[PDB]
Amino acid sequence: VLSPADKTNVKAAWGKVGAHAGEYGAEALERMFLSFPTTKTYFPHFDLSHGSAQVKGHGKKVADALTNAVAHVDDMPNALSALSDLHAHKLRVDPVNFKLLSHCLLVTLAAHLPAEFTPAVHASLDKFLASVSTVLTSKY
Template structure:
């Protein structure tokens, strides 16, 4: 999939609004995923999956950070994602 210049501008605009709250949103997204799709918990057998758990927050931070890094390097997605 190729993103147009307008698409890239829109993506950057959305992530600019997320700003410094990406870590919080990442943890919230994981908690919602576990609540909505309980079967996904099987992929994290070693995690404490309780709401507000440090492990869920840490993983949410990692995922959100990777997304922010990707958006910051939207013209080099392969390079940005290779760190994962």
């Protein structure tokens, strides 16, 4: 459940990220792979080294999916249906891994938006990421 305040906070913050969306997504992934090495086993076929074009490429897809969910915050289940099907059914992603990636995305934003990452904005983004994660794990 996202409040009208959360929704504006998340929009604001994504507004501030602007065109760095893809880049921050990639950085979030690298943070995840380094801090939580078990996550890497879902990407055996990626090169996960720093500067990897595949990681960069993937961070852009992840950031686009997040923006699509912000853009349709009121109907995320529908917006994210294909993706939740991919993650639960085909990929078999452990739900715990969503918490880890969510955390790294918050860390990334904190590291890049000193003014924007207030306690209230932190809380709103955490809720948004949790809602996205809920949708993405809803199809088991």
